[PDB]
Design a protein around this nucleic acid. Sequence first.
RNA 1: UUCAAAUGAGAACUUUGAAGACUGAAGUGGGGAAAGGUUCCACGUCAACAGCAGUUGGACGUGGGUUAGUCGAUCCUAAGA
RNA 2: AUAUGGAUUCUUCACGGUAACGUAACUGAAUGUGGAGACGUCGGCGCGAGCCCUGGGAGGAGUUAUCUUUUCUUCUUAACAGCUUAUCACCCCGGAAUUGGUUUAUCCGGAGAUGGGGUCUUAUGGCUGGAAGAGGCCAGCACCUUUGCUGGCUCCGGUGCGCUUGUGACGGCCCGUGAAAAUCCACAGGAAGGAAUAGUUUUCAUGCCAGGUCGUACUGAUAACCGCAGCAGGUCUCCAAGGUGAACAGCCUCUAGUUGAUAGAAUAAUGUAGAUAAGGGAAGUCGGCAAAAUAGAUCCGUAACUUCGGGAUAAGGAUUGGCUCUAAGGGUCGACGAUCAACUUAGAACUGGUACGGACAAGGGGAAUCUGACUGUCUAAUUAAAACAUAGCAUUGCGAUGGUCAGAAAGUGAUGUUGACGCAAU
Lengths: 109, 77, 91, 114, 97
Amino acid sequence: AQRVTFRRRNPYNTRSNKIKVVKTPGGILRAQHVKKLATRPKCGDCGSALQGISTLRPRQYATVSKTHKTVSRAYGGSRCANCVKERIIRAFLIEEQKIVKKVVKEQTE
Amino acid sequence: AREITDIKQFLELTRRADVKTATVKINKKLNKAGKPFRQTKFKVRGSSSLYTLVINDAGKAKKLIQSLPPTLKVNRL
Amino acid sequence: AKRTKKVGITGKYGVRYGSSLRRQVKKLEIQQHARYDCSFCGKKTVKRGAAGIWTCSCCKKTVAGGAYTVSTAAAATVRSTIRRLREMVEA
Amino acid sequence: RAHAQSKREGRHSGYGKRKGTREARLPSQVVWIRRLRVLRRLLAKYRDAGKIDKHLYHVLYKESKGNAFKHKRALVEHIIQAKADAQREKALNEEAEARRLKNRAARDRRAQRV
Amino acid sequence: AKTFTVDVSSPTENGVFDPASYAKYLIDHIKVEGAVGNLGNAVTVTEDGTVVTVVSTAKFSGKYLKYLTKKYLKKNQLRDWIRFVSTKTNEYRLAFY
RNA sequence: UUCAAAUGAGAACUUUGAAGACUGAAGUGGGGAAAGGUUCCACGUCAACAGCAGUUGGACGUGGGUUAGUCGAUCCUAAGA
RNA sequence: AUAUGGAUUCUUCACGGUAACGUAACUGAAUGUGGAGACGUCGGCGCGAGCCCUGGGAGGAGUUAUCUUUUCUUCUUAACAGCUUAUCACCCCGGAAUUGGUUUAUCCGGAGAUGGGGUCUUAUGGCUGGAAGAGGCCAGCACCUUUGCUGGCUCCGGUGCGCUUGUGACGGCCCGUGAAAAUCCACAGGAAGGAAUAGUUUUCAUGCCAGGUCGUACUGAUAACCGCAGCAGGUCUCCAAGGUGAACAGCCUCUAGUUGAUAGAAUAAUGUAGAUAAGGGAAGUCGGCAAAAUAGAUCCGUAACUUCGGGAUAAGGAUUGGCUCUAAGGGUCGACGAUCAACUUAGAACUGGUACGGACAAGGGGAAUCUGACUGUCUAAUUAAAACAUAGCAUUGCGAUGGUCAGAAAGUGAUGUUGACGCAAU
Ligand SMILES: [K+]
Ligand SMILES: [Mg+2]
Ligand SMILES: [Mg+2]
Ligand SMILES: [Mg+2]
Ligand SMILES: [Mg+2]
Ligand SMILES: [Mg+2]
Ligand SMILES: [Mg+2]
Ligand SMILES: [Mg+2]
Ligand SMILES: [Mg+2]
Ligand SMILES: [Mg+2]
Ligand SMILES: [Mg+2]
Ligand SMILES: [Mg+2]
Ligand SMILES: [Mg+2]
Ligand SMILES: [Mg+2]
Ligand SMILES: [Mg+2]
Ligand SMILES: [Mg+2]
Ligand SMILES: [Mg+2]
Ligand SMILES: [Mg+2]
Ligand SMILES: [Mg+2]
Ligand SMILES: [Mg+2]
Ligand SMILES: [Mg+2]
Ligand SMILES: [Mg+2]
Ligand SMILES: [Mg+2]
Ligand SMILES: [Mg+2]
Ligand SMILES: [Mg+2]
Ligand SMILES: [Mg+2]
Ligand SMILES: [Mg+2]
Ligand SMILES: [Mg+2]
Ligand SMILES: [Mg+2]
Ligand SMILES: [Mg+2]
Ligand SMILES: [Mg+2]
Ligand SMILES: [Mg+2]
Ligand SMILES: [Mg+2]
Ligand SMILES: [Mg+2]
Ligand SMILES: [Mg+2]
Ligand SMILES: [Zn+2]
Ligand SMILES: [Zn+2]
């Protein structure tokens, strides 16, 4: 079987030196250096992967349109749908409870 | 390298004022039944991308070659 | 079938370290690897992370606890004492 | 190729030709995974095709997680026997309820004529 | 039905060849389902004097035809003067040198 | 290791062909890091070196050769300075 | 830097979907928030790639006394782009015990399971463009040169506890929970600027310009490094074919590489290395030193003692080849039928100079005593041990204006990003 060599001067099997063995149109086997895989962006509230947001290396996000990096909702590509809904419910209920607490304080005096 | 499918879009691309070269490539493929047909690829060299239109109809291919602008450097074969 | 008569989880240690030490380690390894009831969601899904950290796989709530048990008896006593003193302070 | 063909026909596989343990030659875990996967896919196929209901499926799934079944043939024969027993019980209960209904009808007409 | 043609005109006109013997060898040695000589309505080998034609419905290939032709040439010490060469697909010839 | 041919004043050791072998992919294979610094390659060439030899060489003499927006350095911070 | 097109706006800064969310766009300052960068190790399982094996066919080469539809070999597809494609996760309907679903591994479900229908990440795979014009394998011509051409084929599958590697969802482990920063993006917010003989939008498409400096040869070692040298030493790492075999073991082979060690002639003693040996079997010797014996796998069987975990491969036995069969263990499609596919185990007969883990490969065992619990560590270059360490046990100091220890001194320092379940000294 044909054997391959690193294409860069790094001879060590480090995280940044991963290679794949591909066959070229010349009919031979050659190493191709593969970038480290991207990590899905994660919700800032619960930590789950954010649905609908592309998974790219940090600087690749500068080369894609806004549609790839956000979701049409109140917190886009920052918080997940369930965490946004929980934020809505908490905000509304706590403001209502603030109103009732204020009136209770006013009517207990 | 991009593939296009609209004849009108290809004709628009052929006049984009930065396209100065095209190529017409003839292939001898088979139409999923063993019959050897003539496939024509029109490849227009844009500044950033090479646009390829694939036509499996030799008559439509000849019509497109006739309709190509006369200042395109058509580069048959 | 019952694979070991008494060593239990400490069968991994073989014949080493002494029977008394293996028993003492066995008790606390059983405690630290046990599943505990989540006080928040009511599910038997609380497991230890590092020492003193106990996380529920459901509802993702983590509570600070003992090194090998979720709640030490000293901490339960301190909780009761603090509840009593808070009640005396408020009334 | 000739030696591979001979091995496929089963030659050169005796005790004098084995140097690794049986587990080394073929893991018992691999064998069990194969057996349990064929048992589970057969159970799922039967449940989807309606040959068994979900309760018998659950019982047989737990039994197949237990050893309880030498192979697919054993599971199929056990399913056959279980369904035969279920049919027997159902027929017995149907006949008992038919006899009860007959007796109730006779009692009713007796009371209406007496 | 697949057709394979062999142009023997060059070595037959250069004297040292026998198209009839080569064809007879083809019927006698072409195997069908492992058995030789059992070419019952499945392999036909016809002759014209310059072109040997094989029509096959059973398992047959140009590789097998070349193998049998090389065997025949070796048997008749006709190698190192005759080559079984493919000009077009399933169209071969006996190049003479 | 062997045979023949070529070259040469001179051939066990150079070259080519033929043969016999080995490393047997954790190589006597193909690349690199440190280090070396031209040892790379071509031509000429054997006084010295290659603990025999030498027409050969990592030798001697003269030349040629290392082409990047994308590979690295450069930038970041680590222990630390 | 930019001009068009596209988009948006008369309801100024978009529409659609119940929703998860979708898109070619679809304003967004300060400030703040979040994410990526960004992370351990092992185990099994799934998937991908490359390799391996293999069928048909289209070419070339080898063998052909005989046999071999035969042996070898080519049949390939990059970055990038468009469409599409997952596990996981999420959404809508619904309310489940006769509890169901489900992994190799037992987790999940009224905090909403199963089920039905959808959304999403694009690792990855598929098709297409790149791209057959390339590369590969051939054929037929011509050749004072440059060698010139002219044609053909470069296709369709299968298989898996296979190897290497990547990855996914998990599980085990910790008094160990296994970097940081540059950088990039998103979100909250609404500062500000915005339309109607017209405004907005360089996160949509296309278009224009530029991208400097230094390194780049070669060896990387039984000759390019270090060891005084062309030194049997030392020196970090990537890829990794077939067979036998559990195997990256040993042995043989393919690709690639080498055939380099001063040679020739004899075959004395004594050597170095490898071996054999009648009968005896440690009587040798300080001492079984050295050597021999054993060895793989399957089946049987396994004592004292024990911290119950082991001892244990205890001990001690039987078998193993070849060949011809038999049986069992599966996938897919519609109790069976059709079809496809790979090995593992068991058994039987036959057979031979009773041979068969036939080369290779590969435990000697037992009864006890002293000693150290064990794994581990050291005198590199005469000592590997009972020595050191170790977990365990115990003692000591210290509550920070402190204990222990540094510094010539300091507005100095280690423990200390520490606080008695700690640090320090034994
Ligand atoms: K999106
Ligand atoms: Mg194995
Ligand atoms: Mg097991
Ligand atoms: Mg020599
Ligand atoms: Mg030679
Ligand atoms: Mg060897
Ligand atoms: Mg060898
Ligand atoms: Mg040189
Ligand atoms: Mg010399
Ligand atoms: Mg000399
Ligand atoms: Mg020189
Ligand atoms: Mg770079
Ligand atoms: Mg729109
Ligand atoms: Mg569900
Ligand atoms: Mg991809
Ligand atoms: Mg590795
Ligand atoms: Mg280089
Ligand atoms: Mg090199
Ligand atoms: Mg090397
Ligand atoms: Mg040196
Ligand atoms: Mg094997
Ligand atoms: Mg003797
Ligand atoms: Mg004897
Ligand atoms: Mg004896
Ligand atoms: Mg004696
Ligand atoms: Mg004596
Ligand atoms: Mg003595
Ligand atoms: Mg010895
Ligand atoms: Mg034994
Ligand atoms: Mg013993
Ligand atoms: Mg010791
Ligand atoms: Mg060990
Ligand atoms: Mg020493
Ligand atoms: Mg020593
Ligand atoms: Mg000691
Ligand atoms: Zn969230
Ligand atoms: Zn919980």
